[PDB]
Amino acid sequence: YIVQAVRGTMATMSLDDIIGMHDVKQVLHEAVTLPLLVPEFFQGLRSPWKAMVLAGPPGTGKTLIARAIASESSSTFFTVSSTDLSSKWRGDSEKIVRLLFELARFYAPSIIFIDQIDTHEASRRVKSEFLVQMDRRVFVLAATNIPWELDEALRRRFEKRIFIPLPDIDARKKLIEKSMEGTPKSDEINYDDLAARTEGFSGADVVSLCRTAAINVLRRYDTKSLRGGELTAAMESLKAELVRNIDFEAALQAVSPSAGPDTMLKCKEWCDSFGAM
Amino acid sequence: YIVQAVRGTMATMSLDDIIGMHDVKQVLHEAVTLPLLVPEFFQGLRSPWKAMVLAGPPGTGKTLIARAIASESSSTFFTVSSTDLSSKWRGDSEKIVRLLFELARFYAPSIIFIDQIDTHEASRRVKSEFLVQMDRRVFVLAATNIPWELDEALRRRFEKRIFIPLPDIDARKKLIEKSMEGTPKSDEINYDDLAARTEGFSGADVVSLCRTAAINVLRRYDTKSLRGGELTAAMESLKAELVRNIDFEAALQAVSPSAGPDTMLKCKEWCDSFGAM
Amino acid sequence: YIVQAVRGTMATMSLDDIIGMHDVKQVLHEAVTLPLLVPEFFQGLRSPWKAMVLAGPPGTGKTLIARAIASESSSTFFTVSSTDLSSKWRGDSEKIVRLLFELARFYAPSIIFIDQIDTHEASRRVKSEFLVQMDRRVFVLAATNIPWELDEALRRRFEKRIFIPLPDIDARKKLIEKSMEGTPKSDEINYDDLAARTEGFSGADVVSLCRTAAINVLRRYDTKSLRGGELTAAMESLKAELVRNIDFEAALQAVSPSAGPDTMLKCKEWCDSFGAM
Amino acid sequence: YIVQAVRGTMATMSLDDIIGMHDVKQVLHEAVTLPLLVPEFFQGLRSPWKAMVLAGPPGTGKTLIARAIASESSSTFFTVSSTDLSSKWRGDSEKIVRLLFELARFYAPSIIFIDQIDTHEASRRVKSEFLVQMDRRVFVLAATNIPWELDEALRRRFEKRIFIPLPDIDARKKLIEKSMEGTPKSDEINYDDLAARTEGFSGADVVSLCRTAAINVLRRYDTKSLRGGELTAAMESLKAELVRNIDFEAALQAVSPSAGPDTMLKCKEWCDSFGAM
Amino acid sequence: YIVQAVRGTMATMSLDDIIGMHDVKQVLHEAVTLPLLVPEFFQGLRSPWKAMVLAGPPGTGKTLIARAIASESSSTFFTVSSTDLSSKWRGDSEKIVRLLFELARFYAPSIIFIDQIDTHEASRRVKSEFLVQMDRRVFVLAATNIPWELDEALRRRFEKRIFIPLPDIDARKKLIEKSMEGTPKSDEINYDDLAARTEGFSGADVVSLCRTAAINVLRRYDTKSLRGGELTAAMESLKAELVRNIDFEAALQAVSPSAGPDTMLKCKEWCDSFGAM
Amino acid sequence: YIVQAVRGTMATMSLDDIIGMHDVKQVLHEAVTLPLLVPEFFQGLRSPWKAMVLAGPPGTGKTLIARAIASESSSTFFTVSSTDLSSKWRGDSEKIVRLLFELARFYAPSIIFIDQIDTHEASRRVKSEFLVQMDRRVFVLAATNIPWELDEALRRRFEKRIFIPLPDIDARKKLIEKSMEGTPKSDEINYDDLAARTEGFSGADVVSLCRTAAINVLRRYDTKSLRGGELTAAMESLKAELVRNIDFEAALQAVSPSAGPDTMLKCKEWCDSFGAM
Numbered sequence A, B, C, D, E, F: 001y002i003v004q005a006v007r008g009t010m011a012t013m014s015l016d017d018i019i020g021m022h023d024v025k026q027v028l029h030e031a032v033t034l035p036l037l038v039p040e041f042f043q044g045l046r047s048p049w050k051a052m053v054l055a056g057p058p059g060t061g062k063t064l065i066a067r068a069i070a071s072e073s074s075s076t077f078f079t080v081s082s083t084d085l086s087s088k089w090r091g092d093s094e095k096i097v098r099l100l101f102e103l104a105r106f107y108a109p110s111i112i113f114i115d116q117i118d119t120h121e122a123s124r125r126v127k128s129e130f131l132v133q134m135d136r137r138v139f140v141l142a143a144t145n146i147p148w149e150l151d152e153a154l155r156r157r158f159e160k161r162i163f164i165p166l167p168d169i170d171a172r173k174k175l176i177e178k179s180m181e182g183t184p185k186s187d188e189i190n191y192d193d194l195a196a197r198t199e200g201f202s203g204a205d206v207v208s209l210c211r212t213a214a215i216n217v218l219r220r221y222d223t224k225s226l227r228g229g230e231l232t233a234a235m236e237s238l239k240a241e242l243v244r245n246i247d248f249e250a251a252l253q254a255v256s257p258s259a260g261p262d263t264m265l266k267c268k269e270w271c272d273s274f275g276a277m
């Protein structure tokens, strides 16, 4: 009908690129890979969940893991907006979802994920609209970062509600090192040492840090002096040239955690209290 | 027309699945079935309650019963959407509800049920339009959990406004014992003491917590059997386990059931005063 | 064409089924019939009434008086919707709100009544359109429940603004005893003390209350006669057992008013202040 | 055609029936008739005002003078709708608003007036269409009570912005006495006490007030004579009786004018604030 | 065929009766006639201005200017509206336009102008159909007073977008004297003290002001004290009578500008910013 | 069908011709030279980027740098806009999108340069196809001028999104001297003091400035006092007359951009933050 925006969300790296949450990845592999192999278990009592609840700080791989599983997804995924923004003239944007579940059955093994459901009156209209259609073999999920704003029933509805804590300095060592895979770099780098200053970072913080040094190294030497737009040998030796703490040092001063840690403490106190598995 | 879109409203289990509510259960057993069976006395002042009110937290088997009635019902249901869409082409679907009730007399015995229908302009427009459509014999009902949002005249118009608290240890006894049916389950278990440890939960809590033990089967098994394709021990034996007190024991600390029921307490204060039977 | 929708809008008991409204029943008996029995006096300077104002709580005999006058009147009623639908092909039914009056002319004296006329642009458009078509002998009236929401010119335009007091003890008395018609009962019943019990209520309260004792005619019995098919001796003795004060004990403990007195009391403040008679 | 529907826009009591507004009635007497009697003075810069701007609390003799002048009107008025359908079939009902003035001049030096035409796309399409259509001798007019409805061009288009406040007291004297016309009445009246105690009201208030004591003439007499058809000596002597101050005591206490001067006062500023003479 | 509607769009006084916009008056002697007299200058860079844009506070002689223009313009004018009211029978209008620029070059380098061109898909239909037909050398222009609805593409293609504020007191003074033409008038006059009260007043206000003292002349006589409707010789003394500062005094105190300034201020800001010259 | 028409999309110029954004000259030495010469530095994280688009004014050499890169590029180029105005005869310019990728891989290292990016439903058939395909170092680029032209996430999809500054000065002098070609004018002209105070301007602005002084040719002389309908040899020597520096004086100071530079600052911050390089 008006499926421009509906057909728009028609949709088409590796899995354990991400490192952490043995319980989560476990329960998901279990929840997803197995019933294809073993439908006979997953039945009524035994049958799997098609979603849960989640939350975490932004830039913490919740959108990247979506690509990790879309990459895993030998099944089908359906893409997402937080904005089914009709007009006062159009006024109806959850019959959209009444066609969505037709897509879900159409691509019968079907996958969906959003962030920040917490996205007035028509809010209650469509937000309420999703609930009856919420309940053939399908998965979906969603997440936020302010489950303190857990509004109505999703402490009831959903079997698990994960707040993620940031990786520890040990992890962050292993995760820089997972981020530094295949990098020109001097051997002065003790990742345990530099990670002393990373405390408070997310994944992406460390990402754009290692990048910030990756282009520090570009901008160290006569980098303004082009060859007039041509190749010099040393310019190719940039790949040959290494990254260093001093090439991080600009990245060290440059990058900051720059976030509300007390928010994580708040929604972590939440994640124990009405915060499901 | 949207007439076939009105034909989108076209419809086409057991009772002891449900536990509790024996007053309501006989009230509805009676008020629904027996008018079929004694038209000679279900009449006049003895008219069938064509609707009444409802309340309580959701995920309380209201949708579950709402399906159980359907597979139970010897009448003509009609599929229901609160998303009677809002085009700037007709801008009127409570008219199409005039066509609905037309179907209701066409399918002279019939059933409908929606929920959370506390659902500016369009609200009073199409709602009050329906109220014009409000008043052979037919039954419909609806529900919500916000009698806080007891909008204008709904509470006054219905026979009984039914709040439900959480179940008790004996309700929870039979509810556990219903979830556990046909299950590989050990016999060392005091499901009544387990139910004693169910302080202030839902039915669905019992459901997905029995499931939490159901996965705890795997968690006790060699859950690292991620050989994949290679069937092995895991494929050979998922029926082997019998669930045990320890499965549920971990399942308990796994729980963060839901938020506080202080709003359920609130409308429970409403369910007495201004809340009918 | 869509005028045929008004051809669908064509329309084609006793006052002693009702209690009170002495002023109103007077003024309507009078203002309608007696000019129709005395065209000669009640005309010109003695112009008979064609409309006035109304409002109050619902379930207050507005529907009851509606269908009551329907089966009563010796004149030409026409059915009443709020569905002058809104096509974005024509989007103009106020012409049919003129052919309205053509029907008032073709049926020279006519009867119409709506309620809850809260019924953007198009609202004001067709509204003022009716203010044009508004202004031989005809009477029509309307009502709402929000004279607080008496929109712009309605209060000014009508003679009689109406406030419906809730019933008093003797109102309650005859309202019961009329509600207790066709009612094999016990004679312990003290309708006076019962009327004492039942303050803060309306007529529909007595309706559903008498019905509550009505189902209690069963539920006094061994209520679970689920033999089924077996014509239980109750099924012959249905009307046999009597109404008893126990049945209204169980009922009236089951009853809530579902009444917010402060709103009807609010427009009761209005019913003197900008509230005509 | 719809052009033939314009044939439905076709038209075919006096001033001193009305009281007050010596200023207005002067300007109208003058601006209408004296050009029609003196083409020689009234021309060029002495051109007659073919329309201007009007206000007042509605139902205060605006449509009433609109009729009374039509009885006076010794020229060619034709009837006036705000109802040209929003047909998505012919592109513009404003086409007939173009043939409008062809009908005017082809017919005669002509007369037009509407009320409450404060009156989306098609709205301003046809509106501006008339704004061109307006710009020999012809007269037109229009009114409202919407002070904010000087939408785009309206303040500029109409020369003088006319408003009528609520009456003063000697007004209420002469307006009683005009409302006391054709009235057998007791000479005990203190019209000064009447206009005094009846202050701040509309004309229509007084209309229904005289009708109120009028019906009161019965409501003292044997209203209870519900024989029906059986004549009463009053039923012949209905007009025989005179009305009394005691009757208008009832007619006082029974009513609230059902209007606040809030927006009446707002336009009582707008009549000065961007309100021409 | 129906294109004769454009044969009906055909059309066939002084020019310089205006005080203001002297730079524009230059521009419109200059892009206009001297092309018709010296194309040798006007071609290439020198070529005449193809078109531009206009707006301002309504009724400031802007809709009246074009009568002066075409009354003076020896070149050819054809009328304009927004009257492309097509039919679904036609399913199209802008074949008109293809025949319309052909109409232009068919007769001669011609004259065209609309007001309120701020005027579903049909807008895109006739607009996209137009804007190539937009482009032997000819001039056209348009105007509005709603630059809030101003375009980008026509803000793009157009050379200029002209605003006028209200006049100034000396222009206003010589516009009294322009409005005091053919006018019996006294010698106690102070045209700049007259113009002192022009706060908020534009030209048309002064037009109706001279007409307001003009009517004031009779308003000093007694009108409804008829001469039997006779042409009283005092009515020729009106031709003898002169108008006076006192005669305007009443109009000045009695009259508002009937307008709002800050919208003219709004587009006076847009005329500088994103409004071309 | 459109294969030979597509053979016109084929394409192939000094690059410091376009001046400023030398950081971007590094970007394009790193997007043209090095992804063709040395993608070994540009590996993994440093890997070549996919494509982007551009905010900025026009008159900014978007196609200048495009063709300059093109004939400079060891990669190929294509002549592309959004003006694939498809037909029923063509049927699918989305097959022309697929053919665009096909030619891109055919001339495997290639460049494509497009704007009119937001230039009906066909926009979304093609846009969706292109969005799906985009996934080698076959670099591509688009552009626009609307900063809010981020469609839904296609801005979010891109490598980067850049706003660009105003131009340098010696080409403002030189291109003054390009548009002033073949013009009568003085030799005193300080084209770098012309180009000095050009702050915030573009090309056609200054073309209209050339026309502006070219009419100042007259508007020093008197347009009102003609030669009496004659064409005095001065009136034709205006063609012979010299335009000069101070002939632009009012054309310099009074002429404004009429554009928003602080939204340019907004989206400039958007390419500083939340917009990549």
Ligand SMILES: Nc1ncnc2c1ncn2[C@@H]1O[C@H](COP(=O)(O)OP(=O)(O)OP(=O)(O)O)[C@@H](O)[C@H]1O
Binding pocket: A017, A018, A019, A020, A056, A057, A058, A059, A060, A061, A062, A063, A064, A065, A115, A175, A178, A202, A203, A204, A205, A207
């Ligand atoms: N555990 C991890 N292992 C490796 N990389 C990680 C991990 N967590 C985060 N990252 C890196 O940080 C980036 C953050 O991506 P992503 O946007 O998915 O986080 P996010 O929380 O979903 O952000 P947002 O919630 O704002 O969308 C990832 O692309 C990834 O490269």
Ligand SMILES: Nc1ncnc2c1ncn2[C@@H]1O[C@H](COP(=O)(O)OP(=O)(O)OP(=O)(O)O)[C@@H](O)[C@H]1O
Binding pocket: B017, B018, B019, B020, B057, B058, B059, B060, B061, B062, B063, B064, B065, B066, B115, B202, B203, B204, B207
């Ligand atoms: N008394 C009960 N008997 C059986 N099952 C129950 C009971 N209470 C809750 N449940 C279980 O809880 C789950 C959710 O119940 P259900 O959705 O029907 O309640 P609800 O009020 O309709 O919730 P919602 O309206 O939010 O969907 C069901 O799977 C149901 O089996």
Ligand SMILES: Nc1ncnc2c1ncn2[C@@H]1O[C@H](COP(=O)(O)OP(=O)(O)OP(=O)(O)O)[C@@H](O)[C@H]1O
Binding pocket: B153, C017, C018, C019, C020, C057, C058, C059, C060, C061, C062, C063, C064, C065, C115, C202, C203, C204, C205, C207
């Ligand atoms: N004066 C009365 N006499 C008899 N019955 C009454 C009276 N007033 C109220 N009732 C009872 O109240 C019940 C509901 O009244 P009714 O529906 O007519 O009021 P209402 O304003 O039309 O309500 P709604 O508009 O919400 O349907 C009826 O069954 C009627 O018997």
Ligand SMILES: Nc1ncnc2c1ncn2[C@@H]1O[C@H](COP(=O)(O)OP(=O)(O)OP(=O)(O)O)[C@@H](O)[C@H]1O
Binding pocket: C131, C153, C157, D017, D018, D019, D020, D057, D058, D059, D060, D061, D062, D063, D064, D065, D066, D115, D175, D178, D202, D203, D204, D207
């Ligand atoms: N001075 C007066 N003389 C006579 N009648 C008056 C006077 N002032 C007010 N009225 C009364 O006002 C009443 C209604 O006025 P009218 O209907 O003309 O106004 P309206 O605003 O056009 O009404 P509506 O808003 O319903 O269209 C008339 O019955 C009339 O008698």
Ligand SMILES: Nc1ncnc2c1ncn2[C@@H]1O[C@H](COP(=O)(O)OP(=O)(O)OP(=O)(O)O)[C@@H](O)[C@H]1O
Binding pocket: D153, D156, E017, E018, E019, E020, E056, E057, E058, E059, E060, E061, E062, E063, E064, E065, E115, E145, E175, E202, E203, E204, E207
């Ligand atoms: N400077 C002026 N010189 C001459 N006449 C003027 C001047 N200013 C205003 N007027 C008068 O104002 C009247 C209304 O102006 P006009 O309708 O032409 O302008 P407009 O703003 O286009 O009006 P609209 O946009 O509402 O059609 C004209 O009759 C004109 O005589």
